[PDB]
Design a protein around this ligand. Structure first.
Ligand SMILES: NC(=O)C1=CN([C@@H]2O[C@H](COP(=O)(O)OP(=O)(O)OC[C@H]3O[C@@H](n4cnc5c(N)ncnc54)[C@H](O)[C@@H]3O)[C@@H](O)[C@H]2O)C=CC1
Ligand SMILES: Cc1cc2nc3c(=O)[nH]c(=O)nc-3n(C[C@H](O)[C@H](O)[C@H](O)COP(=O)(O)O)c2cc1C
Ligand code: SF4
Ligand code: SF4
Ligand code: SF4
Ligand code: SF4
Ligand code: SF4
Ligand code: FES
Ligand code: FES
Ligand SMILES: [Ca+2]
Lengths: 156, 439, 120, 225, 139, 226
């Protein structure tokens, strides 16, 4: 049971205006649906395939190819902590252990209430201020494991 | 650290409070004058010739000549639909130059894209920008709107007669999207699988049209060339690779950061004069010059100039010249394990050797990290490095993946040999069948 | 598993069988007949069996009056035990889902990772 | 005018270096046991007097034999359908030693004139419904619909109607409309076809009770029942 | 170097004597994994070659084998003379501890070979067996 | 055009790539992703041959014979040690995650992957870790689906989309978790979906009608018919 709203459809069409192919707005269409609904459900793939005219298999391949186009339900906030080499030298494992101790889950799982979804991510492009962590729209640098509980209370 | 316009042709206009520079402030400090000279006093062909004579190498990591790349577009006038792409992805670990280049100086990128679009007569330009750079995206949209309002983007720019439209395409977070053909594929809304070369993107690129993909730092380098001349750009350093590169050391150093230095400065100077060396109670073990896809080097390689050919002579690459320092406390087996986990979980999945051999190296390094290594794993890793070199795979992600593995095998073989504790056992004893015992 | 390897590895061609499949998905022979008047007891069917199902037991007293009665069927070859190989099961190694064996429950096989999973 | 069928395939006396062509591969199994349930005496294998093939593996199936009729593709080290690469002069092109089958006629030296009898514009007559043929891949063949695997694949028989004509009849999709053709008041559920032109009823040809000869015929007494 | 490699066998002295006796355009040498010099010899010179091998200083006093072969279906006959059928004679020199295989090529219609019974009396049953199984007539 | 394979001079068609240029002459190169009708994409990396540009060249370069044009004056080696070892390594990499399913597989004795596993002479397994698995979709009454046997050669998506024009079969997934099928379960609605049982080199897409009453390829009695 899915139906695109007015704002999502108008934004999708405006993204089709930017290119010479309606296929090229598929990634931004999926990002619009992810922004509105938290993730991309099953009917959204067919709705985007209907508005763009491309096959639904293409939309499914694009949606499942990219990591930050979520195809499964997430919590209220998605924590994306960096696990790459520079933050490993800076010790991201302490922050991962702190988040595992606080949220009492594993990387990739969601809490029973649906508050935080903990996920590793690639390099955040801020390696000089490592280690970093990207919550939904905010990046955090110079992290310490003791500041994790104080950091997680700013997202109810 | 003070930055005159001469030896810092890009980083002299930032702000001490680390705030972006807008159109009035950018234009106040000699901004959009290289674009003015390019659109008013020069043809596109002589602009391409000026960039070619400047010796501006592409700062994306390969160092290919940008003017020669611009000269490879088709000279036929029947193809007037042309595209310029700015690779603002920067998904390599250890790379942070583009973030500083667009979060604080977006109008420099806009001016360089104007100049490069006029040089190619490219009708449209796209900034393929990564999804994590949010403030950079906001600054880019604000800069595009401000330049469009004040007669710098759109229709009849300055009155020359050149129409150019600039867009920001925010990516969905895949490491392989940074590759130029995969960037073109992801720009067209498809999966980010790279394409075969030849045909190169300069002839049949985005939507089958002539399309030139350039790094952010190359487009930030071009307006200084167009404003202050070509021979001035050739008179910055006495090195074969002309220009200024944004270098810097990162990772357990005293002052990690980003500094614009001329080519030929030795890597010890960046570690000591700028990064300050190692931290309190730390020693130096290794370093890696060009992000995660580069070979490790030792202390004896620290007094080596930071050029393409000099680092390429000593069994490594210049890359993005954003070096990473690895101390003595960090175990190299676990470090290479993390590098291989990143390189195997971010593979595009098209071609066989990377897709089905990088996880094998990941599992072997997992066994070595836990001490469960078996005899024959290091030889397997060496043959894996041999068979994942250039030409074996469809693209260059896997040679860059196996460069640190072979460098750590070469220099730190005693750390890899320490992870083997259990004997080799692949089969198990089936009751009723005598096994074959090769000798 | 009715894989027909013993029938083709037989140099005489005295094994006849047809594959049938149950409701769960596992394979078995619908019938399995050996023409013992043609068999030479060369042990190539036991040698070529990938599941260790067919075995030549040490039994020789097989005298018959009519050679039509020498054609043994599936009801006469199937015994009530494992035989010479006691602790081998092919379906614990195979990657096909059967009853009591979900995907990933085989030997040296991991659990299936869905393409919609959020883990990069 | 049927003289070309002699050249379609060579006769039963055609041999590749004296031997026939094999219908089964060289590693055919169970010769002495596939008929042992009936009788332990294996009979003589059947003889094909009509054609050049034989019901046995005592035949020629090499990829380099001078023949055009290939029963199956097999090469040593090539067991897949990719074994057809050995049976061609160039891979992907024509079959080696020519493809089987010949054309019965050539192109004529001169052609026909202009067909002058143009038809009239379709005007929908009231009461009579012109039958528009809706052929399906699974169900319009006489013998393929007899296959039990096509019964789980073929669609249900729907009579296809314009939205305007269905609104005129008052019928909605899902309900049954009965139509009579030569004393057969047969009921079919209704599907709505926007692309169908008004005045026609869409019928699937080759189905149960709906012959392909119904195409173009009229259909009176089309009422909801 | 392994023993199963295709050895062309020009280092055998018998090949040198045959080249010096019958000329360099009388026979062909086949490279095989048999470990045997395989000499394709014309049908007219078969008896001359047999007498020459019988009258060597360390001669081939043994007819080890004599049998025919159907070459009508052999697709890979590179380096081999054109033949529908062939007859091979395997001879052994015990004192030399050597052996040779002489092959004569025959067409499908002209299936007659000069007999080998006079040189070696044990060729009688082998020629009878070759006639029975291959249809090759021995004059 | 004239090419040289292992010192042998061959007259070939210069408008063709090297893979079927060598396959026309009867020269065996292992290959998965290339098809004569679909084209070349350079995916499986199995068709490697060592190319030399001069007649006196020692090193050469391991190039893709399906992606290198057969121009006049290319000296390629197929049975070289480096090329053979790389092809064996590619077969081994495809065999790391392949299930132990050959007896219970509908393409046993009809498998392209079996022919290229025996062709490269790979019979020893030194991979000791776990193997990835995938779920299966119900593709209808015709196609039986077993994704565990896939090798990600991209032939199914190429044929079904760029050749057959179908819209319901696609490539999804990730690095190594690549999936080939529909976004949900249901019948493949293309009228040319049946050719996937022979386009696919492995036993992923198989004939379900044949799988009901199944016999091996050597047990089949064939005939040419219309
Ligand atoms: N975030 C970053 O900055 C990263 C940078 N890299 C760099 O990327 C490099 C690999 O780049 P690739 O594009 O895969 O390979 P490449 O070195 O062959 O190509 C790089 C550039 O050279 C041009 N080029 C080279 N030869 C050409 C020719 N004959 N004709 C036309 N254009 C030609 C290409 O068009 C492209 O713009 C690595 O060596 C590494 O240094 C790698 C990973 C991340
Ligand atoms: C796997 C891979 C990832 C890459 N990622 C980036 C990137 O994130 N940013 C970039 O500028 N170049 C990247 N490149 C290099 C590009 O191929 C190319 O050099 C770039 O688009 C333009 O470089 P140029 O400045 O020399 O013209 C990557 C290359 C590979 C093989
Ligand atoms: S090496 Fe192959 S699988 Fe890996 S990222 Fe490149 S094209 Fe994709
Ligand atoms: S032992 Fe008998 S049934 Fe088995 S392969 Fe040998 S002859 Fe055939
Ligand atoms: S007895 Fe063994 S070899 Fe024969 S069909 Fe059954 S599983 Fe296969
Ligand atoms: S597809 Fe081929 S290799 Fe895979 S299980 Fe089936 S027969 Fe074996
Ligand atoms: S399912 Fe088959 S055709 Fe498709 S990529 Fe996998 S092996 Fe190739
Ligand atoms: S390595 Fe973590 S921000 Fe770059
Ligand atoms: S056949 Fe050439 S890479 Fe697949
Ligand atoms: Ca008949």
């Amino acid at each position: 049971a899915f139906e695109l709203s007015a704002a999502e459809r108008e934004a999708i069409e405006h993204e089709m205006h930017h290119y010479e192919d309606p296929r090229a707005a598929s990634i931004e269409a999926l990002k619009i649906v992810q922004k509105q609904r938290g993730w991309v459900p099953d009917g959204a793939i067919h709705a985007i395939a209907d508005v763009l005219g491309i096959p639904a298999s293409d939309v499914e391949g694009v949606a499942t190819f990219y990591s930050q186009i979520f195809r499964q339900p997430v919590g209220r906030h998605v924590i994306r902590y960096c696990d790459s080499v520079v933050c490993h030298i800076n010790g991201y494992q302490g922050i991962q252990a702190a988040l595992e101790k606080k949220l009492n889950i594993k990387p990739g799982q969601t809490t029973f209430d649906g508050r935080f979804t903990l996920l590793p991510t690639c390099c955040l492009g801020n390696c000089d201020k490592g280690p970093n962590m990207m919550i939904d729209e905010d990046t955090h640098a110079h992290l310490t494991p003791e500041a994790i509980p104080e950091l997680l209370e700013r997202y109810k | 650290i003070i930055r005159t316009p001469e030896t810092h042709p890009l980083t002299w206009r930032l702000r001490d409070d680390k705030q972006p520079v807008w159109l009035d402030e950018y234009r106040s400090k000699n901004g959009y004058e290289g674009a003015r000279k390019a659109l008013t006093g020069l043809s596109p062909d002589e602009i391409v010739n000026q960039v070619k004579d400047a010796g501006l190498k592409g700062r994306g990591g390969a160092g290919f000549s940008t003017g020669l790349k611009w000269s490879l577009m088709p000279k036929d006038e029947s193809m007037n639909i042309r595209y310029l792409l700015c690779n603002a992805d920067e998904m390599e670990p250890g790379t942070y130059k583009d973030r500083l280049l667009m979060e604080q100086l977006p109008h420099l990128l806009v001016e360089g894209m104007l100049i490069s679009a006029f040089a190619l007569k490219a009708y449209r330009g796209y900034i393929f920008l990564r999804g994590e750079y949010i403030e950079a995206a906001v600054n880019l949209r604000r800069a595009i709107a401000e330049a469009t309002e004040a007669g710098l983007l759109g229709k009849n720019i300055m009155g020359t007669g050149f129409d150019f439209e600039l867009f920001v395409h925010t990516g969905a977070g895949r490491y392989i999207c940074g590759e130029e053909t995969a960037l073109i594929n992801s720009l067209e809304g498809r999966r980010a699988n790279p394409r075969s070369k030849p045909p190169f993107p300069a002839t049949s690129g985005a939507w089958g049209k002539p399309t030139c993909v350039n790094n952010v730092e190359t487009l930030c380098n071009v307006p200084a060339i167009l404003a202050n001349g070509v021979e001035w750009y050739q008179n910055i350093s006495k090195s074969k690779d002309a220009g200024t590169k944004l270098m810097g050391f990162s990772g357990r150093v005293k002052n990690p950061g980003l500094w614009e230095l001329p080519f030929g400065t030795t890597a010890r100077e960046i570690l000591e004069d700028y990064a300050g060396g190692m931290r309190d109670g730390l020693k130096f073990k290794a370093w890696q010059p060009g992000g995660a896809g580069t070979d490790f080097l030792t202390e004896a390689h620290l007094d080596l100039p930071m050029e393409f050919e000099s680092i390429g002579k000593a069994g490594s690459r210049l890359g993005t010249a954003l070096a990473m320092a690895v101390d003595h406390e960090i175990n190299m087996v676990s470090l290479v394990r993390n590098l291989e986990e990143f390189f195997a979980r971010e593979s595009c999945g098209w071609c066989t050797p990377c897709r089905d051999g990088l996880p094998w190296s990941v599992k072997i390094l997992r066994a070595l990290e836990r001490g469960e290594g078996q005899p024959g794993d290091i030889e397997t890793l060496e043959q894996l490095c041999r068979f994942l070199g250039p030409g074996k795979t469809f693209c260059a992600h896997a040679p860059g993946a196996v460069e640190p593995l072979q460098s750590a095998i070469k220099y730190f073989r005693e750390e890899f040999e320490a992870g083997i504790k259990q004997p080799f056992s692949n089969t198990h004893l089936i009751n009723g069948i005598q096994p074959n015992l090769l000798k | 598993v009715a894989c027909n390897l013993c029938a083709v590895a037989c140099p005489v061609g005295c094994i006849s069988l047809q594959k049938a499949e149950t409701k769960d998905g596992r394979w078995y022979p619908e019938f399995f007949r050996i023409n013992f008047s043609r068999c030479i007891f060369c042990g190539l069917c036991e040698e070529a069996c990938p599941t260790t199902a067919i075995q030549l037991t040490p039994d020789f007293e097989m005298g018959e009056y009519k050679r039509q009665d020498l054609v043994y069927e599936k009801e006469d070859l199937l015994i009530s035990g494992p035989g010479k190989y006691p602790e081998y099961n092919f379906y614990r190694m195979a990657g096909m889902a059967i009853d009591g064996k979900d995907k990933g429950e085989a030997e040296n096989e991991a659990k299936p990772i869905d393409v919609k999973s959020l883990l990069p | 005018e049927l003289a070309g069928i002699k050249d379609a395939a060579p006769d039963a006396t055609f041999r590749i270096r004296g031997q026939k062509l094999a219908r089964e591969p060289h590693r055919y199994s169970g010769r002495t046991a596939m008929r042992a349930n009936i009788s332990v005496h294996e009979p003589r294998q059947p003889q094909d007097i009509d054609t050049m093939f034989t019901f046995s593996m005592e035949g020629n199936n090499q990829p380099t034999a001078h023949r055009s009729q290939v029963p199956f593709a097999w090469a040593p080290g090539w067991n897949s359908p990719q074994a057809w690469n050995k049976f061609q002069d160039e891979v992907g092109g024509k079959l080696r030693f020519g493809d089987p089958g010949v054309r019965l006629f050539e192109t004529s030296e001169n052609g026909l004139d202009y067909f002058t009898s143009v038809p009239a514009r379709f005007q929908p007559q009231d009461g009579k419904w012109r039958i528009a043929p809706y052929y399906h891949l699974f169900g319009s063949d006489e013998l393929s619909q007899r296959a039990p695997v096509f019964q789980s694949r073929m669609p249900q028989p729907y009579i296809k109607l314009n939205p305007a004509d269905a609104a005129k009849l008052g019928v909605n999709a899902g309900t049954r409309v009965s139509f009579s053709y030569d004393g057969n008041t047969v009921t079919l559920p209704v599907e709505i076809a926007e692309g169908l032109t008004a005045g026609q009823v869409g019928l699937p040809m080759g189905m149960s009770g709906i012959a392909p000869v119904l195409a173009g015929a009229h259909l009176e007494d089309l009422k909801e029942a | 170097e392994p023993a199963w490699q295709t050895r062309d066998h020009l280092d055998d002295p018998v090949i040198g004597e045959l080249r010096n006796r019958f000329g360099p355009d009388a026979f062909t040498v086949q490279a095989t994994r048999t470990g045997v010099p395989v000499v394709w010899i014309k049908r007219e010179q078969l008896l001359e070659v047999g007498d020459f091998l019988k009258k060597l200083p360390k001669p081939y006093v043994m007819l080890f084998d004599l049998h025919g072969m159907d070459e009508r279906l052999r697709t890979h006959r590179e380096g081999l003379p054109a033949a529908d059928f062939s007859v091979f004679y395997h001879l052994i020199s015990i004192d030399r501890n050597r052996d040779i295989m002489l092959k004569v090529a025959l067409a499908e219609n002209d299936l007659h070979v000069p007999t080998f019974t006079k040189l070696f009396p044990n060729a009688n049953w082998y020629e009878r067996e070759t006639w029975d199984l291959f249809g090759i007539t021995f004059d | 055009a004239t090419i040289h394979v292992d010192g042998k001079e061959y007259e070939v068609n210069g408008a063709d790539n090297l893979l079927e240029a060598c396959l026309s002459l009867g020269l065996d190169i292992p290959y998965f992703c290339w098809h004569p009708a679909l084209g070349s994409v350079g995916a499986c990396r199995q068709c490697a041959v060592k190319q030399y540009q001069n007649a006196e060249d020692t090193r050469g370069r391991l190039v893709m014979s399906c992606m290198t044009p057969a121009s006049d004056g290319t000296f390629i080696s197929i049975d070289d040690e480096e090329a053979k070892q790389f092809r064996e390594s590619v077969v081994e990499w495809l065999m790391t995650n392949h299930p132990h399913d050959c007896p219970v597989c509908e393409e046993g004795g009809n498998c392209h992957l079996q022919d290229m596993t025996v062709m490269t002479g790979h019979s020893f397994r030194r991979y000791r870790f776990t193997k990835r698995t995938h779920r299966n979709q119900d593709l209808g009454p015709f196609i039986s689906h077993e994704m565990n046997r896939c090798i990600a050669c991209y032939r199914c998506v190429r044929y079904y989309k760029d050749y057959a024009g179908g819209t319901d079969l696609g490539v999804y997934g990730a690095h190594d978790n690549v999936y080939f099928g529909r976004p949900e379960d249901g019948t493949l609605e293309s009228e040319f979906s049946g050719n996937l049982v022979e386009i696919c080199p492995t036993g992923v897409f198989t004939d379900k009608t044949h799988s009901e009453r199944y016999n091996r390829k050597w047990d089949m009695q064939f005939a040419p018919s219309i």
